Amino acid sequence: EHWEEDASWGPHRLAVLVPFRERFEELLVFVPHMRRFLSRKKIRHHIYVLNQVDHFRFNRAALINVGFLESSNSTDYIAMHDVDLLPLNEELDYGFPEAGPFHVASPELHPLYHYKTYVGGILLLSKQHYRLCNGMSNRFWGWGREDDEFYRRIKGAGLQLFRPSGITTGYKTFRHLHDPAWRKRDQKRIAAQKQEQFKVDREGGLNTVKYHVASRTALSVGGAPCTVLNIMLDCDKTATPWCTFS
């Protein structure tokens, strides 16, 4: 039922954790694309659409944290997966990342971001490895720096980061359906946000995330099923005032 799976597939169940708010066109293409892609690669999976329905700025990392907590307690691993980044090459390892976190959307392959420590887009971890990092920071509202920070959590935890090798498709490895004019990145740094972005967050993450699920809805998109989680993220306006206005 819950898991798309056949008896012959390897046992590891992947939760696809998709940070989401107002990307409907993209969602329509993404869900069946990922059902097809994962099924051909024989990966047991379920797709969680993590829909931010509070009115705070978009918090990718906090949503991933929520999806981690709210996914089936029998998932073995997670892929934080942008909704607009579609894998076109089946050589990409979406299998269980046993030796360490696996960064699918490598800077060698990503259309826009090419620096060594970029871990955005699509990144896979075993549940144990994600907990070892205490998940992602909750302090990043708006576009930017939540991934750079998580990189530091991975490194600090002594986890080795893996990337695809021998991929030949280069910058055509993914379809990045993202018009920068229609989908404007919320990149404004509001006051003290421009400082805290690069800080060394020592306290919080997976164990301090403040939220509640408003609704949970089964959604099927052209045959391909998923679970939409309507997520209300709390904001301590004292700690992070840059959460509001947008």
Ligand X SMILES: O=c1ccn([C@@H]2O[C@H](COP(=O)(O)OP(=O)(O)O)[C@@H](O)[C@H]2O)c(=O)[nH]1
- Closest CB 30 distance from Mn ion, rounded Å: 12
Enumerate helices (H) and strands (E) in the chain, giving the number of each.
5, 9
Is 146 near ligand X (CB under 6 A)?
no
19 or 87: CB nearest ligand X: 19
Question: Which residues lie across from 225 on neighbouring strands?
Answer: 220
Is 82 near ligand X (CB under 6 A)?
yes
Q: Is 245 annotated as a binding residue?
A: no
Half-sphere exposure of 51 (CA within 13 A, CB side): 19
CA–CA separation, 48 and 97 (whole Å): 19
Q: Which does 162 bind (CB under 5 to 8 A by kind): ligand X, Mn ion, none?
A: none
Is 145 near ligand X (CB under 6 A)?
no
Site map 27..66 versus ligand X, x via CB under 6 A:
-------------------------------x-x------
Nearest Cα neighbor of 224 from 7, 49, 13, 19 is 49
- Closest CB 241 distance from Mn ion, rounded Å: 26
> Which one of 42, 55, 172, 185 is in contact with ligand X (CB under 6 A)?
185
Residues 119-178 that bind Mn ion (CB under 5 A): 178
Q: Do 239 and 229 form a contact (C-beta atoms < 8 A)?
A: no
Relative to beta strand 224-233, strand 211-221 is antiparallel
Distant-in-sequence, close-in-space partners of 59: CB < 8 Å, separation ≥ 6: 52, 138, 140, 141, 146, 233, 243
Q: Which does 120 bind (CB under 5 to 8 A by kind): Mn ion, ligand X, none?
A: ligand X
- Closest CB 171 distance from Mn ion, rounded Å: 14
Only one of the segments 3-11, 18-26, 88-96, 199-207 lies at the binding site for ligand X (rule: CB under 6 A); that segment is: 18-26
Is 120 near ligand X (CB under 6 A)?
yes
Distant-in-sequence, close-in-space partners of 202: CB < 8 Å, separation ≥ 6: none
Nearest Cα neighbor of 53 from 20, 82, 80 is 20
Query: Which residue intervals of the chain are DSSP H helices?
Result: 24-40, 60-70, 127-132, 146-156, 193-196
Residues in binding contact with ligand X, number by CB under 6 A: 15
- Interface residues with ligand X (CB under 6 A) are 19-23, 58, 60, 82-84, 120-121, 143, 178, 185
Binding site members: 19-23, 58-60, 83-84, 113, 143, 145-148, 176-178, 185
Binding site members for N-acetyl-D-glucosamine: 145-148
